[PDB]
Amino acid sequence: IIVTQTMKGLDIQKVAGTWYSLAMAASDISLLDAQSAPLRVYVEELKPTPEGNLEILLQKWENGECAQKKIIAEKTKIPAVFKIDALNENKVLVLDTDYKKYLLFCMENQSLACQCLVRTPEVDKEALEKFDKALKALPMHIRLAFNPTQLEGQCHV
Amino acid sequence: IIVTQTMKGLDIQKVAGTWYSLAMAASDISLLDAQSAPLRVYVEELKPTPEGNLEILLQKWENGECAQKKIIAEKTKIPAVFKIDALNENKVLVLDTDYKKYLLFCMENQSLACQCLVRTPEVDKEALEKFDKALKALPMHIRLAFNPTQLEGQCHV
């Protein structure tokens, strides 16, 4: 465990819909540095399922182009923690959300990336303040923030 | 002007000697993102001159290799502000330093990069706290921090 902060009383159905990745931070620079870095992922829409699993729609820069991706995160016994299947066991945690404006999450596993999601392409200084407070507890070495023009573009260009 | 914060009473001869670039931040992601990004520069030594100009020794990743660079920053009427000659007029400002441990500086010109320099390859949390306070005033969108192993390597690898 590195991330311990979780949303109390999370109702996953209420995170459905569109989101923007306003800012991102990660434990290691290589996770976010280039446009093609592995965790440089731009979240577009969250689609929880009736059983309370979570489909995640996002964009990622791969092979010189902006690709659409669709991921499923399986629920656990903890409502704020989900699991993605891979060669390694990857954990997704919801740290905090008010449903209507911002959502903070982290993905982990020793290594870690977190984002501040917002509902609209605006610089929400209070959401970023809450993101930065949550990151105080974590060993981050790279932090990115994006402007409204980028959020409204493709793969944040 | 963007950066307004300057070291009161700066004695430039006292910044001489070795330094490490513990952390960096910039106004635009492309200034720092890849290892070959333009402002990804790792400061190794400062050499003020008898007339109070400033030679700067650093490393930069260029063309797949770590190159040694030597730059001169010319003094101005303001002791904390220096100027580098280029196709554009580039301004270097000393924001704060205690000479013995940390030094904060920014280079500017609309666009901007700042670093936290430290004397030894240790994570100085107080120096980073002071860096982050100074950056609160500035429109940064990328921030990097480096670990002791990287500081002791070549071009921070």
Ligand SMILES: CCCCOc1ccc(OCCCN2CCOCC2)cc1
């Ligand atoms: C409540 C917020 C849930 C969103 O969490 C995630 C967002 C993006 C993720 O993407 C991880 C990287 C996706 N890979 C990119 C490269 O291709 C394979 C998928 C994972 C979880």
Ligand SMILES: CCCCOc1ccc(OCCCN2CCOCC2)cc1
């Ligand atoms: C008091 C601290 C002074 C140090 O300030 C600077 C540090 C690094 C700098 O480097 C700027 C980029 C150098 N270029 C890299 C690419 O080749 C040409 C030089 C400039 C000022």
